[PDB]
C-alpha cells in the first residue's frame, strides 16, 4: 500500500506538473484539471477517488490541492508548485515586503551544479520557478521546497532581491518561488551566505 500511495503520488506529480498537455488533459491556466478526466487516463485506472483523497490528504510535502469544482465537473486537482507547464494563474500568495518573507530563505543544491550557480546565479532551469525553502531540511515548518539530500545550501538576501524588482511567492505547501529576473536567473548579487551540509555542516565562501 505504501508503494501504491507513493506510485500514485509520482504519477500525480508528473501529470499535474509536466505531462498534462502531452496526456491530453484539459488543464486550466490555474493548474487545476478535472479529477474525473485524469482518473480516466489508463495509468490511473487502478486508482479510486478515495485513493487520490488519501494521497492528497497525507503526502508529507502537501504537493496537491483537491477541491470541488463546477456542478457538472466534480473534483478539481492541481500540483501546488513545481510546474514545467505554463500555469500563470496558479494561486500563489505574493510576498512583496521584507515582512512577508521568511527570516531564512535558502536554496539546497549539489556540488555538481555549484560552479555553474556561482558563475551565473540560480536558474529556474526546466521549471517556472526557482524553488526556495524557509529553512534547512528538518527545520520547523519546512515541509517542502528543499531536497533532503542536498550537499550545499545558498542563502538568499530576500529584501535585496525585492528592492531590485525580483518577485517572490509562497505556494500552498509553503514553498517560496521566484521566476527570477528576465532570463530566469537569481543572480549571485543576492547570495547572502553558503553552507556545506554534507558530509558535515561547514561554512562555505561565496
Ligand X SMILES: OC[C@@H](O)[C@@H](O)[C@H](O)[C@@H](O)CO
Ligand Y SMILES: Nc1ncnc2c1ncn2[C@@H]1O[C@H](COP(=O)(O)OP(=O)(O)OC[C@H]2O[C@H](OP(=O)(O)O)[C@H](O)[C@@H]2O)[C@@H](O)[C@H]1O
Residues that bind ligand X (CB under 6 A): 5-6, 9-10, 13, 18, 55, 58-61, 84, 126-127
Q: 29-46 in b/e burial notation, b at 16+ Cβ within 10 A?
A: eebbbbbebbbeeeebee
CB of 59 to ligand X, least distance (A): 3
Partner from ligand Y, ligand X, none binding residue 145, C-beta < 5-8 Å depending on class = ligand Y
Q: Does 18 bind ligand Y (CB under 6 A)?
A: no
- Show the DSSP H helices in the chain as ranges: 2-14, 35-39, 49-58, 114-120, 158-163
CB of 109 to ligand Y, least distance (A): 3
Nearer to ligand X, 55 or 122 (CB): 55
Kindly give, in sequence order, each residue whose CB lies less than 8 Å from that of residue 57, ignoring residues fewer than 6 positions away.
Answer: none
Nearer to ligand X, 61 or 192 (CB): 61
Q: Does 192 bind ligand Y (CB under 6 A)?
A: no
- Binding to ligand Y in span 67-96, by CB under 6 A: 82
Cell numbers that stand for 63 in this block: 504537493
List Cα–Cα distances, 165 to 123, 145, 180, 181, 191, in angstroms. 16, 22, 9, 8, 16
Q: Does 105 bind ligand Y (CB under 6 A)?
A: no
Nearer to ligand X, 159 or 179 (CB): 179
Residues that bind ligand Y (CB under 6 A): 61, 63, 82, 109-110, 113, 116-117, 120, 122-123, 125-127, 131, 144-147
Amino acid at each position: 500500500e505504501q508503494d501504491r500511495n507513493v506510485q500514485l503520488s509520482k504519477a500525480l506529480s508528473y501529470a499535474l506538473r509536466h505531462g498534462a498537455l502531452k496526456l491530453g488533459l484539459p488543464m486550466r491556466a490555474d493548474g487545476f484539471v478535472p479529477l474525473q478526466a485524469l482518473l480516466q487516463l489508463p495509468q490511473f485506472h487502478s486508482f479510486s477517488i478515495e485513493d487520490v483523497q488519501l494521497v492528497v490528504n497525507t503526502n508529507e510535502k502537501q504537493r496537491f490541492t483537491l477541491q470541488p469544482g463546477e456542478p457538472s465537473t466534480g473534483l478539481l486537482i492541481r500540483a501546488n508548485q513545481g510546474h514545467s507547464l505554463q500555469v500563470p494563474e496558479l494561486e500563489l500568495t505574493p510576498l512583496e515586503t521584507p515582512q512577508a518573507l521568511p527570516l531564512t530563505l535558502v536554496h539546497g543544491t549539489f556540488w555538481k551544479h555549484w560552479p555553474s550557480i556561482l558563475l551565473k546565479g540560480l536558474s529556474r532551469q526546466g521549471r517556472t520557478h526557482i524553488h526556495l525553502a524557509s529553512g534547512l531540511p528538518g527545520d520547523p515548518g519546512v515541509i517542502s521546497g528543499i531536497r533532503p539530500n542536498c550537499e550545499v545550501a545558498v542563502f538568499i538576501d530576500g529584501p535585496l532581491a525585492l528592492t531590485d524588482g525580483i518577485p517572490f511567492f509562497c505556494s500552498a505547501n509553503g514553498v517560496i518561488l521566484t521566476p527570477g529576473n528576465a532570463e530566469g536567473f537569481l543572480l549571485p548579487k543576492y547570495f547572502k551566505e553558503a553552507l556545506q551540509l554534507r558530509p558535515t555542516r561547514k561554512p562555505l565562501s561565496l
